[PDB]
């Protein structure tokens with residue numbers, strides 16, 4: 612079974628941790644990758660009810676299993692905070708415009 616389901620993509624908690632670990636490391640080094648400069652500040656315009664405190668940062672999680680290294684970010688994101696705590700996994704899939712919905 613999927614721990615997180617983003618549209619058609621299936622993710623296990625181990626997939627999330629690997630992606631999150633990579634994103635946070637770049638965050639610590641103040642470096643970014645990709646045209647959208649990830650990891651990027653996530654403002655939570657959606658108003659998701661995360662149990663961890665902000666600031667939040669979004670980092671692409673890929674259905675392929677590989678860690679994001681530039682190129683197309685796809686539609687899924689892992690959101691983590693400054694304390695490297697997972698806030699949630701969200702996606703553009705099934706969301707209006709450039710908005711996000713949480714993965715189930």
Ligand SMILES: Nc1nc2c(ncn2[C@@H]2O[C@H](CO)[C@@H](OP(=O)(O)O)[C@H]2O)c(=O)[nH]1
Pocket residue numbers: 647651652653654655656657669709710711
């Ligand atoms: N929907 C949404 N986009 C955000 C938020 N914070 C930052 N963004 C960024 O603004 C951009 C335009 O909505 C998004 O780019 P993306 O569409 O390439 O992922 C996303 O990275 C937020 O809280 N909600």
Ligand SMILES: [Ca+2]
Pocket residue numbers: 621622623626676
């Ligand atoms: Ca996997």
